[PDB]
Symmetry: C3
Subunit: 374 residues, 3 copies
């Protein structure tokens, strides 16, 4: 009878048979282990580590602006002005901004043949050591194989390059644009959690326009002003701005958006920290500091090309936005509940071992617990 079998399946309840052993020590140990498992599963997995939540990584867009002007007026270059259009190269970058702090300039370079800067490698005599096509470490020009006179006292290998070649052996000390220490950087950050489709920007709802006109970030007094002074950025990373400005470097401004979207959106707040991203190691490094070369191009009255070559040392400020949002989800919750239910059986296993192998009456309990089918 299939119908009778189905009715029996539906209208009967099956529960296991249990043996109740009266022992203070074993019972207390069983309860202690069960309490130890429950405390783990609740306090650590759920309350502490939030095992009931799904997570999503942040999607960020950043806008950066620098303010400040430096005035130098020396003999070689004369009176010079350095505003934002002069010391920010290139005009725009993604999640980054370079500020020039030291400079070496070479004005009126033309394409042609010229001697190199005298040193151990380039200095020559009799046009014998020079090798055609050898660019050398400079890699600024291609050697023509001839050995010409740099000046009245030394002879160097001739190269095909923009001439005269740059001389970068004397980096200015202190940094040329050392006034950049008091420039200020604004960081505007818009974040997005696509999974929860949640958006926020780092200028909080209580941060007004009047306040943003004169604020400077401070970890204690102004923890949410998005305007940072460069010297203070370097100082908060554990370094010195004047030391770092001579040869340049990389500075990380990292924004943490760890948020709990179970609570009010007003508590999803950014946290700022600062970390130097380049390393000082004179024995395990190549191209220390931070610099690059760019040029300004001109034209002679006859149409011949001329350029000013700039070797720009400076600090690159990288904006690093990271963080995870969390919202309650039923799948991790049920996974953890089932895991705890399964783990509650380790107490039974351990107590069975004790009852059956480390007891005086273990044979009696073995007889009571196990039935041999014969």
């Amino acid at each position: 009878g299939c119908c009778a079998a189905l009715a029996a399946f539906l209208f009967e309840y099956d529960t296991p048979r249990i043996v109740l052993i009266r022992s203070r020590k074993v019972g207390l140990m069983n309860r202690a282990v069960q309490l130890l498992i429950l405390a783990y599963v609740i306090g650590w997995v759920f309350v502490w580590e939030k095992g009931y939540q799904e997570t999503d990584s942040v999607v960020s867009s950043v806008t950066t602006k620098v303010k400040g002007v430096a005035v130098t007026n020396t003999s070689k270059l004369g009176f010079r002005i350095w505003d934002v259009a002069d010391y920010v190269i290139p005009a725009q970058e993604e999640n980054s901004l370079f500020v020039m702090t030291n400079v070496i300039l070479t004005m009126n370079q033309t394409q042609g043949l010229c001697p190199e800067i005298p040193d151990a490698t380039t200095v020559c005599k009799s046009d014998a050591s020079c090798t055609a096509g050898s660019a050398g470490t400079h890699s600024n020009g291609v050697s023509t194989g001839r050995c010409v006179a740099f000046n009245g006292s030394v002879k160097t290998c001739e190269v095909a390059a923009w001439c005269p070649v740059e001389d970068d052996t004397h980096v200015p000390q202190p940094a040329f644009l050392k006034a950049a220490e008091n420039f200020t950087l604004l960081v505007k950050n818009n974040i997005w959690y696509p999974k929860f489709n949640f958006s926020k920007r780092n200028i909080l709802p209580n941060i007004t326009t009047t306040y943003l006109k004169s604020c400077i970030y401070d970890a204690k007094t102004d923890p949410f002003c998005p305007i940072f002074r460069l010297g203070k950025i370097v100082e908060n990373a554990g370094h010195s701005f004047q030391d770092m400005a001579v040869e340049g470097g990389i500075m990380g401004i990292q924004v943490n958006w760890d948020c709990n979207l179970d609570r009010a959106a007003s508590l999803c707040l950014p946290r700022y920290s600062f970390r130097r991203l380049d390393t000082r190691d004179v024995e395990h490094n190549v191209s220390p500091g931070y610099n690059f070369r760019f040029a300004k191009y001109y034209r002679d009255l006859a149409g011949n090309e001329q350029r000013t070559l700039i070797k720009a040392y400076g600090i690159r400020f990288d904006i690093i936005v990271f963080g995870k949002a969390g919202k309650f989800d039923i799948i991790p919750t049920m996974i953890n509940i089932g895991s705890g239910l399964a783990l509650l059986g380790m107490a039974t296993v351990l107590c069975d071992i004790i009852v059956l192998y480390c007891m005086k009456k273990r044979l009696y309990y073995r007889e009571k617990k196990y039935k041999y089918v014969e």
Copy 2:
């Protein structure tokens, strides 16, 4: 006998003893709860949320190109041409592209001393309010401490800057390059899932060269043409291009690559949406819109430096590529199967509570279920 014990361990099967209670209500409730747990575990965890899959985040590379030219011919600037080399600054960017839509120009600036633009802060009389070294909000020059004549009717504080200083108090209305509304942007996207080592590009296999010569993206008619009109990009985000072009802004073009790699690769398709990334808030904002300054550098016949300063307003288009791929994995599958097996015992727990504490014959069932070892 160790061998006898091992044989007993290997050649015996152990199964629990079960009590079968005949009750329609309790049995039906047991089956209902078991069915409720099975339906959860299958339908929600496996079928709906794909709990049998491992996931991997996308690695993306983007190439962007703009097409279009604008012709303006006014009195101050005369006849001007704006092609791609003029309104895209810088020539290249990563996952981004800036299009200039409004402009303020200052031609023939030289480094020197000049008065500021008259306003409440800068206007002065008798050379008393001026403070040396105070850059002011302009931060375009350093105040020299002298109060000089801007013109015949007002006196302002003298600054060391590129002179004459920029006057950005009258932003053109409507936008200067308002013809950028009909420029078109091409977005080429190559994606990579390293875990599954799967690659695809957003130009699908059925998208031909002839079609790509004249297509424009439409959510309904051309959902896979990677060529977007700028005005339409802004419109699909819920905004107006002409309004946004006066002061600039940030526009997000986000590409979603949510794919199921259990199926054919032909179904891994990109989905396009548009979202404005900057905020309009006159009470809780600093530096609204989007603009930056860059310069073109020239040289006098005597070698003196001159520059044209450009304050460029425009819209930055950010390409945001996100998504996760999914493939069947055995580890999550077995974790979910074990979790469901463990969770099936909640029905037993609940039915035991009912049988032992909320029944008329609960004492009889308690006697039948539990054995006291004495």
Copy 3:
């Protein structure tokens, strides 16, 4: 008595009753399935796939520098020098670097009216086909509606553009800057795992300054030199540099930082691979290769604007840094242990099916296992 009930709850141990069936086949199958589940849970989940670890994605910062100079000296352009400031456009980029390998130049362009380059679309006669405002495919200028003479033998539509218009119909072959094959690229990479707060850079502790002065990356001999030759980068991706240099392309240099932070930090090492990111498909592509336009701006003696337009073909090198770190965590460990404990019951289920439905004495075992409460 509540106290008596509590004492009974605390001082009693409950364990299930078991039926022991003596059968070689069923017992052996039970043990085989249990061993098969244990081998899975240990070997695959724990030992092989490291199911006892939490993971974290890498946060990376990259610095790139190119070295090399090319000398060309032809008739149209004359003697030219191309150093780093000439062929890297823009001076700086994020996680990227473009090297120019082919070039088309247009010198002395002025804003005005000029004919187009003769072709099927532009050629005209009698000033009838020309349409005012139609930018055309060139989109370099706006058509004025007039049909003027390109030269003595053909007439084309007049446009408002920078004049004369660029002629990009003859891309140089072989590439103009084909000497870029032996340029070298340095990639400095600093990584950070915020969850474990672990930092490392790709210049390893045993990589000295003397070694870095002359090393070139090789997968077999120098697997940790961060200096790559461009031609070799393209070759290791399965392509030819000279072929790729004519029209340009995108090359991916991907750094893998898969590390196990349970072990010494000295074993967290970078792995380098190379993949071309652009596709060759003459039937399913738009804008093949890789190129962009930028200009150098000059000024006439009268102050009129002039520019040199450069169409730059080249290879964009993208630095793709990915990887996950792993450290032992107790939560995944306990989840997997509980899952295995739950999964160990499938053996009992299967063996019960066999014992109760596929046995000669199945009725006797059914009587021994199940108790009917009456």
